Design an enzyme around this catalytic site. Structure first.
Site, PDB file in Angstrom:
ATOM      1  N   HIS E 202       9.175  31.396  12.065  1.00 43.22           N
ATOM      2  CA  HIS E 202      10.096  30.810  13.032  1.00 43.22           C
ATOM      3  C   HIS E 202      11.552  30.945  12.608  1.00 43.22           C
ATOM      4  CE1 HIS E 202      11.673  27.479  15.677  1.00 43.22           C
ATOM      5  NE2 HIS E 202      10.855  28.102  16.505  1.00 43.22           N
ATOM      6  N   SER E 206      10.162  37.975  14.560  1.00 41.39           N
ATOM      7  CA  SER E 206       9.379  39.169  14.288  1.00 41.39           C
ATOM      8  C   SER E 206      10.261  40.410  14.214  1.00 41.39           C
ATOM      9  CB  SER E 206       8.306  39.373  15.358  1.00 41.39           C
ATOM     10  OG  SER E 206       7.326  38.360  15.295  1.00 41.39           O
ATOM     11  N   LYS E 228      -0.189  39.242  27.841  1.00 41.75           N
ATOM     12  CA  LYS E 228      -0.539  40.381  27.003  1.00 41.75           C
ATOM     13  C   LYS E 228      -1.531  39.981  25.916  1.00 41.75           C
ATOM     14  CE  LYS E 228       1.530  44.415  24.778  1.00 41.75           C
ATOM     15  NZ  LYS E 228       2.755  45.063  24.246  1.00 41.75           N
ATOM     16  N   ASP E 229      -1.501  38.718  25.486  1.00 41.04           N
ATOM     17  CA  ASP E 229      -2.472  38.236  24.511  1.00 41.04           C
ATOM     18  C   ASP E 229      -3.859  38.073  25.121  1.00 41.04           C
ATOM     19  OD1 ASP E 229      -1.332  38.054  21.955  1.00 41.04           O
ATOM     20  OD2 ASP E 229      -0.240  36.231  22.492  1.00 41.04           O
ATOM     21  N   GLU E 272     -21.342  42.744   0.712  1.00 45.22           N
ATOM     22  CA  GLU E 272     -20.966  43.018   2.094  1.00 45.22           C
ATOM     23  C   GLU E 272     -19.885  44.099   2.143  1.00 45.22           C
ATOM     24  OE1 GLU E 272     -23.657  41.087   3.979  1.00 45.22           O
ATOM     25  OE2 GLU E 272     -21.924  41.184   5.310  1.00 45.22           O
TER      26      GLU E 272
END
Ligand SMILES: CCCCCCCCCCC(=O)OC[C@H](COP(=O)(O)OC[C@H](O)COP(=O)(O)OC[C@@H](COC(=O)CC)OC(=O)CCC)OC(=O)CCCCCCCC
Ligand SMILES: CCCCCCCCCCCCCCCCCC(=O)OC[C@H](COP(=O)(O)OCCN)OC(=O)CCCCCCCCCCCCC
Ligand code: HEM
Ligand code: HEM
Ligand code: HEM
Ligand SMILES: COc1c(O)c(C)c(C/C=C(\C)CC/C=C(\C)CC/C=C(\C)CC/C=C(\C)CC/C=C(\C)CCC=C(C)C)c(O)c1OC
Ligand SMILES: CCCCCCCCCCCCCCCCCC(=O)O[C@H](COC(=O)CCCCCC)COP(=O)(O)OCCN
Ligand SMILES: CO/C=C(/C(=O)OC)c1ccccc1Oc1cc(Oc2ccccc2C#N)ncn1
EC number: 7.1.1.8
Lengths: 54, 74, 248, 93, 385
Positions: E202, E206, E228-229, E272
């Site tokens: 925050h 980004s 879009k998410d 795994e």
């Protein structure tokens, strides 16, 4: 007009997507189960019990 | 009614390819047969098998029999 | 490692429950239980399967009640405290042939036969490996292979030397519906019965998965339309530059 | 509360970039546009050059590593067969 | 003002998912962070409902999981969504970290954001190790035997860390009971680190795929990146539903359906798939103490990247040499996972030792040398001298 009778009044635009989803559950589950059992006919236990009656 | 898997394995062991692989297992089987009558019972640390020749014939019969066996079974 | 130490690869057969829309063949499950009672159950246990789970899958309700009443189970002690026995009911689990592990090894030359409730999911190969093991005993091993006494040759077992002998022969079981009981037919039926023992939810899981995939596919295609509608003002935006006048 | 430290991003009205002068922008409402005008003129030519102007940076490292793994798998298969038995004692020394 | 900005609890919601300014040019790679938040909720909620039916005693642990699969109503749905959901959690996390390497998200002023993410990755690995022990299958017992025996090679304290980790002399009943209690706790520590991760984000916002400043053109989060998410949320759920209902045991090992036996060793001990590259790095060092140090150095070497990148440009979009060596590093990681599932045999032993060297040489040798050369090529291709 069919916007203002279906999607304007958002006291039932929250409502109709909450009530159309109730009757959606029973019609969808009846249609798939009938298709799924007809695709596998002759293999279920009810098709076996009908002639292991002997 | 005889066994259905034994019939299909009998048929494909007499194709043109099956005769070649049955023959290749037979030549290794006598090579061990000469080998086991000399001094060399507990010797030599390197005695031979025919597992690789047996595996080649079984791998040919499995790719021919398996996609058509379950049509002949109830 | 060599090919003998890994084991021969099991081929693919056309099982009728392979596929996203297929159920089990329930007549093949019913014949497969008869091969278990008459052949397998002399040395193998089925410990995770209760009697009540067979009702409505392979047998009727009064058929399973008569099957469970041929075995006796432990009961609560009496008023003096001495133990009692009682016949079985639908709540009980299917009993095994040995009391403990030491009695199982003593009857099979030191080898322990495993519990078969999960054997289809506990081996690489699945139904194809179990079927190829039962129908894959040669009449003699290949030339050179010397088995220890008390073992048998099977090429699908890793190492090639297995402690169980061949048990299935032609017409050893009389079927109720009249199927010819060859070696290939009895091995196919008991593998289908053992796959139901490992995966009892199988027919229900594939029906619930069809409703989930159809609903989630519709929500994915609708979200692409809605995203492309709500982004069209940004995607067609245009810019023009006019250089400002100096001296400010 | 106390004031914070100095960052490189602000908020709406004081975002923190340079001063803008001389740029005009135009836009049209989405309600007045054609519905879904993409699968063609985008799968025709646009969604081929967007990766095949980039494909050579991916497939040259992919071809190097796939050649290396496939060559080592065939050599391990030769060493544990009958014909590669004599080399197997030599390289396990 | 509006109530979403004046209320004390709604202004935190408004400044994070409603009114937060995003760069207008971010692509679908920037959607992986919100998929990781959905995966953590799925793992926590299916975890509580299964824990109402689970017993952690070593005589009862394997049969409790079989009791969930057979007797609990929709119990097979809870387990299969949980086990397959852990593999989907690691796949989205690998793509999220590889996006940060490609676009230079680790660089200043986002170093604190990158360092908190490395702590999250360590805690997720430890979580999946402890849940695999709680099955007490045959792969559960012997995988815990191999990993816990590594710590006895530490000098002067090693033979007492291991028996403090066992509660005894081997992997036994006190080991499984304490591993289930730790398995409940660490996902709540992960959820607190995610909150500290979102606070640092925050502050600066980004980055964008061009590598340059985003302060000149911002659009708000609500109804643009919310919708879009939704496209990637529904695609994620559809592919996860195809694995849960139609192929539920493809991403597992069939030896884990055999109950744990401390007297019979399996023919092959394999982890795994998402832990296979770190398993191959450990087996490539012959000394036992240096092998466990190199295994933990493979995670901690992610912290040197803010100091070894020498470029004056953020990201890989306009650099052809950095593009080539990024994909060399990606396919080297896939090869290390494949070597970790093979036997210790010729020629896989030497191949794993070369691939281990290439992993560490990317962070410490290749990145500072290539980014120095690309600084000079940009200069002399423009300057007239
Ligand atoms: C694992 C379980 C998780 C499931 C969900 C995870 C999804 C991961 C996918 C990787 C990713 O996130 O990046 C995707 C990236 C494309 O990014 P871009 O913004 O440049 O493309 C915008 C587009 O032009 C318009 O896309 P538009 O918005 O117009 O339409 C949406 C499109 C589907 O979009 C998506 O599903 C995104 C995943 O709908 C249609 O195709 C219409 C026909 C049905 O693709 C690339 O950059 C290269 C393509 C191959 C990548 C595969 C590598 C995987 C390892
Ligand atoms: C310690 C932890 C280590 C973590 C290492 C993670 C390794 C796991 C592998 C994850 C693969 C993810 C690779 C892609 C990462 C996303 C970032 C990226 O590469 O950018 C997308 C790239 C750029 O495309 P553009 O040039 O069009 O955009 C430029 C910006 N304007 O566009 C592309 O080129 C996308 C092409 C992607 C192909 C990659 C194939 C990966 C195959 C992996 C298979 C693994 C299972 C077998
Ligand atoms: C149709 C009947 C039977 C079936 C389907 C069956 C099934 C199986 C299976 C799947 C295995 C495991 C093989 C493996 O580990 O990969 C096994 C092992 C074994 N079975 Fe059978 N079984 C049957 C009958 C019998 C009988 C009648 C006996 C003894 C008289 C027996 C004794 C054993 C033993 C001793 C093993 C262990 C072998 C070893 O580990 O080397 N089984 N069985
Ligand atoms: C980030 C969160 C989590 C991860 C990555 C994770 C991972 C795992 C894994 C890999 C297994 C082994 C599954 C298998 O192969 O069968 C497992 C088992 C288990 N986990 Fe989790 N887990 C998480 C959260 C939780 C939580 C919060 C709980 C309890 C409140 C929980 C309870 C269980 C239980 C009871 C089992 C045993 C049942 C089973 O095998 O499915 N898990 N977990
Ligand atoms: C449970 C785990 C995680 C969650 C929920 C999470 C969440 C997020 C979210 C929502 C974003 C913003 C949107 C985006 O860029 O995708 C973000 C950004 C970022 N995350 Fe994570 N993350 C997690 C793990 C990690 C890990 C393991 C790393 C690295 C080792 C990491 C490093 C970063 C970085 C560098 C950014 C900034 C990217 C940029 O601005 O371009 N995160 N994270
Ligand atoms: C850059 O701009 C962005 C941005 O791009 C994104 C994507 C986000 C996205 C935000 C997220 C993805 C949120 C992150 C996700 C989490 C923090 C999840 C935390 C997990 C939990 C809180 C788990 C809690 C779960 C429970 C309590 C369930 C418990 C189960 C119960 C109670 C069972 C019920 C019991 C009975 C008896 C019925 C931003 O916030 C943001 O702004 C900074
Ligand atoms: C541990 C991590 C913590 C992360 C915190 C994230 C925030 C989570 C909150 C999520 C949204 C919750 C909506 C709250 C509703 C509006 C608040 C409110 O009504 O406050 C009051 C009324 O008081 C209450 O009854 C509080 C309800 C308790 C809520 C507990 C969930 C509204 O009245 P007020 O005028 O005072 O609002 C202005 C405040 N500055
Ligand atoms: C309990 O056994 C757990 C296993 C597993 O895969 O859990 C998900 C496992 C099974 C077989 C063999 C090993 C297993 O565990 C592990 C554990 C492991 O842990 C690390 C990963 C990265 C860095 C350091 C370590 C350690 N220690 N790296 C590899 N395999």
């Amino acid at each position: 007009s069919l916007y203002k009778t279906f999607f304007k009044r958002n006291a039932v635009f929250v409502g109709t997507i909450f009530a159309g989803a109730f009757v959606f559950q029973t019609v969808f589950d009846t249609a798939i189960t009938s298709w799924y059992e007809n695709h596998n006919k002759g293999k279920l236990w009810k098709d076996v019990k009908a002639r292991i009656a002997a | 009614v005889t066994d259905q898997l034994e019939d299909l394995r009998e048929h494909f062991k007499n194709t043109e390819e099956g005769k070649a692989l049955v023959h290749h297992y037979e030549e290794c089987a006598e090579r061990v047969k000469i080998q086991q009558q000399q001094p060399g019972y507990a010797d030599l640390e390197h005695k031979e098998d025919c597992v690789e020749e047996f595996f080649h014939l079984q791998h040919y019969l499995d790719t021919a029999t398996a996609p058509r066996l379950f049509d002949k079974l109830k | 490692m060599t090919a003998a130490e890994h084991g021969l690869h099991a081929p693919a057969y056309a099982w009728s429950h392979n596929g996203p829309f297929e159920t089990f063949d329930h007549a093949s499950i019913r014949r497969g239980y008869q091969v278990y009672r008459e052949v397998c159950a002399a040395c193998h246990s089925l410990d995770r399967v209760a009697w009540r789970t067979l009702v409505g899958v392979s047998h009727t309700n009064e058929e399973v009640r008569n099957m469970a009443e041929e075995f006796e189970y432990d009961d609560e002690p009496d008023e003096q405290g001495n133990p009692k026995k009682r016949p079985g009911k639908l709540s009980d689990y299917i009993p095994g042939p040995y009391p403990n592990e030491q009695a199982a090894r003593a009857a099979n030359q030191g080898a322990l036969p495993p519990d078969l409730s999960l054997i289809v999911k506990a081996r690489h190969g699945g139904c194809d490996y179990i079927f190829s093991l039962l129908t894959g005993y040669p009449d003699e091993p290949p030339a050179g292979v010397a088995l220890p006494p008390g073992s048998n040759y099977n090429p699908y077992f890793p190492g090639g030397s297995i402690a169980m002998a061949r048990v299935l022969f032609d017409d050893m079981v009389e079927y109720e519906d009249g199927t010819p009981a060859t070696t290939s037919q009895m091995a196919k039926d008991v593998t289908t019965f053992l796959n139901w023992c490992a995966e009892p939810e199988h027919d229900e899981r594939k029906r619930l998965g069809l409703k989930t995939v159809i609903i989630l596919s519709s929500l994915y295609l609708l979200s692409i339309w809605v995203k492309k509608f709500k982004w069209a003002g940004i995607k067609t935006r245009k810019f023009v530059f006019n250089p400002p006048k100096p001296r400010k | 509360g106390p004031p914070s430290g100095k960052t490189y991003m602000g908020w709406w009205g004081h975002m923190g970039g340079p001063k803008q002068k001389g740029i005009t922008s135009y836009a049209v409402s989405p309600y007045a546009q054609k519905p879904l005008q993409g699968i063609f003129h985008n799968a025709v030519f646009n969604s081929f050059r967007r990766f095949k102007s980039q494909f050579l940076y991916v497939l040259i490292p992919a071809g190097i590593y796939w050649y290396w793994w496939k060559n080592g798998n065939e050599y391990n298969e030769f060493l544990y067969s009958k014909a590669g038995r004599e080399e197997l004692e030599r390289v396990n020394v | 003002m509006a109530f979403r900005k004046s209320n004390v609890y709604l202004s935190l919601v408004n400044s994070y998912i409603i009114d937060s300014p995003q760069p207008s040019s971010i692509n679908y790679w920037w959607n992986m962070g919100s998929l990781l938040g959905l995966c953590l909720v799925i793992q926590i909620v299916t975890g509580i409902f299964m824990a109402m039916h689970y017993s952690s005693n070593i005589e009862l642990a394997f049969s409790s999981v079989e009791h969930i699969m057979r007797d609990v109503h929709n119990g097979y749905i809870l387990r299969y969504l949980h086990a397959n959901g852990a593999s989907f959690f690691f796949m989205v996390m690998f793509m999220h970290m590889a996006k940060g390497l490609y676009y230079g998200s680790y660089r200043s002023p986002r170093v604190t954001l990158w360092n908190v993410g490395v702590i999250i990755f360590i805690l997720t690995i430890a979580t999946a190790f402890l849940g695999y022990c709680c099955v007490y299958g045959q792969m559960s017992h012997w995988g815990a035997t191999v990993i816990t025996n590594l710590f006895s090679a530490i000098p002067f304290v090693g033979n007492d860390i291991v028996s403090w980790l066992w509660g005894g002399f081997s992997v036994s009943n006190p080991t499984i009971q304490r591993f289930f209690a730790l398995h409940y706790l660490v996902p709540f520590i992960i959820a607190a680190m995610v909150i500290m991760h979102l606070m640092a984000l925050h502050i600066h916002g980004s980055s964008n795929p061009l590598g340059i400043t985003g302060n000149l053109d911002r659009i708000p989060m609500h109804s643009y990146f919310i919708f879009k998410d939704l496209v990637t949320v529904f695609l994620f759920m559809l592919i996860l539903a195809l694995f849960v209902f139609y192929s539920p045991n493809t991403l597992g090992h069939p030896d884990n359906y055999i109950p744990g036996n401390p007297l019979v060793t399996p023919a092959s001990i394999v982890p795994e798939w998402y832990l296979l590259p770190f398993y191959a790095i450990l087996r490539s060092i012959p000394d036992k103490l240096l092998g466990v140090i190199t295994m933990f150095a493979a995670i901690l070497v992610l912290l040197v990247l803010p100091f070894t990148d020498r470029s004056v440009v953020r990201g890989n979009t306009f650099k052809v040499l950095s593009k080539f060596f990024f994909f060399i590093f990606v396919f080297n990681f896939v090869l290390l996972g494949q070597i970790g599932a093979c036997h210790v045999e010729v020629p896989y032993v030497l191949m794993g030792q070369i691939a281990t060297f290439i992993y560490f040489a990317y962070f410490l040798i290749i990145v500072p040398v290539i980014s120095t050369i690309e600084n000079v090529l940009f200069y002399i291709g423009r300057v007239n001298k």
